[PDB]
Amino acid sequence: KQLYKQQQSVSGVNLDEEYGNLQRYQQYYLANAQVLQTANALFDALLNI
Amino acid sequence: RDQDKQVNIAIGSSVAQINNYAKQIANLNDQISRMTGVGAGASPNDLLDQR
Amino acid sequence: DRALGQKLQMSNLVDVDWNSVISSYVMQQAALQASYKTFTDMQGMSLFQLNR
Amino acid sequence: DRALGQKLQMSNLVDVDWNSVISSYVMQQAALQASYKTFTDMQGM
Amino acid sequence: MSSLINHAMSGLNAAQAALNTVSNNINNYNVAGYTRQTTILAQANSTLGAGGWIGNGVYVSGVQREYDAFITNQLRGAQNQSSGLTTRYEQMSKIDNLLAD
């Protein structure tokens, strides 16, 4: 049992760091999408000229 | 006994990726020098990071 | 009687002292939930506030 | 007493340990909740 | 250049892929045999314009397996003993139970 748990320590999903990561990367994805809209406004202004 | 043996395996594992790391740093030297050669002072951000 | 004394001394060397451990257990439980709350809420508000 | 021994030896094979299964049951329920939250977020995209 | 949109699409794709990976860490969780998988990120390739920090975006450089050999292999023998000596004791119990009283 001890050695199985020692294997799990490295291998086993810890479920906390991953959950926090899930949030962290949603933020990143939103950051990307919004940035696209800004470039859209930029070439909108250029087009409207 | 066997866990000291496995400590010996870990030593080889450590050396194993050291070789390749050194190799890619050599490649990075090559490319960074080349890019500055053409760059006139401008250089690649990404390669300076990677080094 | 000597044996009883000996196992008493053994105990001494190894204590549950149930009450101390579970009191600090509750303290740590509250601290844990507090820290997690900090992470979730703060991180959260700041994300969609900043993205906007 | 022979029959008693047989009776318990059968339990060794067939029976289920309540504690292990209930623990795994709760843990997998938590895993389900995790998977469902994952899905609803990813679909939120 | 189409850089303006391309930066965003690169980052968006990379984020989505990393999302899949972290999910894969979640979706399995309980099932034995799995090991946690971790992800790599790095800059985009050098269509460097004319030099300088024209990095053009990002990409995910695959996923890594958190895996081992010198405790992984060492695990098999311990499991072997667990079965064998446990069984030696367990069979004797098969008998002593009958004949003890």
Q: What is the DSSP string of A7-42?
A: HHHHHS--SSHHHHHHHHHHHHHHHHHHHHHHHHHH
Contact state of D34 with E26 under an 8 Å Cβ cutoff: yes
Q: How far apart are CA E3 and CA E13, in angstroms?
A: 15
**Method by which this entry was solved:** cryo-EM
B48 close to B39: Cβ distance less than 8 angstroms: no
Q: Which residues of B touch E46 (CB under 8 A)?
A: 35, 44, 46-47
CA quadruple D6, D12, D15, D19: dihedral positive or negative? positive
User: Residue B2's Cα: distance from chain center in Å?
Assistant: 32
Q: What is the dihedral of CA D1, D6, D11, D12, to 10 degrees?
A: 110
For residue E37, which of E27, E46, E45 has the smallest C-alpha distance? E27
Q: What angle do CA A28, A32, A36 make, to 5 degrees?
A: 165
Contact state of D41 with A29 under an 8 Å Cβ cutoff: no
Q: Which of A3, A10, A31 sits opposite E78 (nearest CB)?
A: A3
Helix (H) or strand (E) holding E59: strand E58-65
Looking at beta carbons, which pairs linking B33-36 to residues 24 or more positions away fall under 8 Å?
Answer: B35/E46, B35/E48, B35/E51
Resolution (Å units): 2.9
Tell me if there are at least 3 CB pairs under 8 Å linking chains E and B: yes
**Alpha carbon of A19: minimum distance to chain C alpha carbons (Å):** 10
How many residues make up chain E in this entry?
A: 101
Closest residue of chain A to E28, computed from CA coordinates = A13
Helix (H) or strand (E) holding E56: none
For residue A18, which of C6, C51, B12, E29 has the smallest C-alpha distance? E29
Lookup result for tokens 């049951």? D25
Which tokens sit at C13?
A: 């060397």
Q: How far apart are CA C23 and CA E61, in angstroms?
A: 48
B28 close to B43: Cβ distance less than 8 angstroms: no
What are the b/e assignments for E23-38, b being 16+ CB within 10 Å?
Answer: bbbbbbbbeeebbbbe
E89 close to B24: Cβ distance less than 8 angstroms: no
Q: How far apart are CA E17 and CA E39, in angstroms?
A: 9
Mutation for testing the D interface, residue in E21, E26, E89 having most D CBs under 10 Å: E26
The count of C-alpha atoms lying within 13 angstroms of the C-alpha of A43, restricted to the half-sphere facing its C-beta, is: 10
Phi, psi at E58, each rounded to 5°: -145, 165
Q: What is the dihedral of CA C24, C30, C34, C35, to 10 degrees?
A: 40
Q: How far apart are CA B35 and CA E45, in angstroms?
A: 13
